[PDB]
Amino acid sequence: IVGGTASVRGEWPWQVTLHTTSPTQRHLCGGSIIGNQWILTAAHCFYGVESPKILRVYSGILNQSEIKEDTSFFGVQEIIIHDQYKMAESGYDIALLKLETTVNYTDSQRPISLPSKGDRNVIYTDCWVTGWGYRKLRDKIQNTLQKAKIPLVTNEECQKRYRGHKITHKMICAGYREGGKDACKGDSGGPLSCKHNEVWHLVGITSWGEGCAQRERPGVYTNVVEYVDWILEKTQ
Ligand X SMILES: Cc1ncsc1-c1cnn([C@H](CC2CC2)c2ccc(-c3c(-n4cnnn4)ccc(Cl)c3F)c[n+]2[O-])c1
Binding-site annotation, residues for heparin:
160-163
> Are residues 46 and 79 in contact, defined by beta-carbon separation less than 8 angstroms?
yes
Per the annotation, the verdict on 188 as an active-site residue is yes
Q: Which stretch binds ligand X (CB under 6 A): 5-13, 97-105, 183-191, 193-201?
A: 183-191
Which of 79, 212, 225, 231 lies at the binding interface for ligand X (CB under 6 A)? 212
Report the C-alpha dihedral over residues 164, 132, 79, 46, rounded to 10 degrees: 50
CA distances from 87 to 23, 46, 94 (A): 24, 11, 11
Q: Which stretch binds ligand X (CB under 6 A): 26-34, 91-99, 103-111, 146-154?
A: 26-34
Could you tell me the smallest distance in angstroms from the CB atom of residue 187 to ligand X? 5
Return contacts of 156-162, CB within 8 angstroms, 24+ apart. 157/218, 158/218, 158/220, 161/216, 161/217, 161/218, 162/210, 162/217, 162/220
Point out which residues pair with 59 in neighbouring strands: 16
Per the annotation, the verdict on 59 as an active-site residue is no
Could you tell me the smallest distance in angstroms from the CB atom of residue 233 to ligand X? 25
Task: Give the span between the Cα atoms of 10 and 12, in whole angstroms.
Answer: 6
> Which H or E element spans position 155?
helix 155-161
Q: Which stretch binds ligand X (CB under 6 A): 59-67, 95-103, 115-123, 215-223?
A: 215-223
Could you tell me the smallest distance in angstroms from the CB atom of residue 140 to ligand X? 8
CA distances from 216 to 118, 142, 204 (A): 31, 25, 19
What is the CB neighbour count within 10 angstroms for residue 141?
Answer: 17
Task: State which of positions 89-148 bind ligand X (CB under 6 A).
Answer: 133, 141
- 219 binding ligand X? (CB under 6 A): yes
Task: State which of positions 192-211 bind ligand X (CB under 6 A).
Answer: 206-209, 211
Cβ-closest position to ligand X? 209
- 28 binding ligand X? (CB under 6 A): yes
User: How many Å from the N-terminal Cα to the C-terminal Cα in the chain?
Assistant: 33
Per the annotation, the verdict on 19 as an active-site residue is no
Which of 39, 153, 170, 182 lies at the binding interface for ligand X (CB under 6 A)? 182
DSSP state, 109?
B
Could you tell me the smallest distance in angstroms from the CB atom of residue 197 to ligand X? 26
Residues making contact with ligand X (CB under 6 A): 27-29, 44-45, 47, 133, 141, 182-188, 206-209, 211-212, 219-221
> Could you give the residue numbers annotated as active site?
44, 93, 188
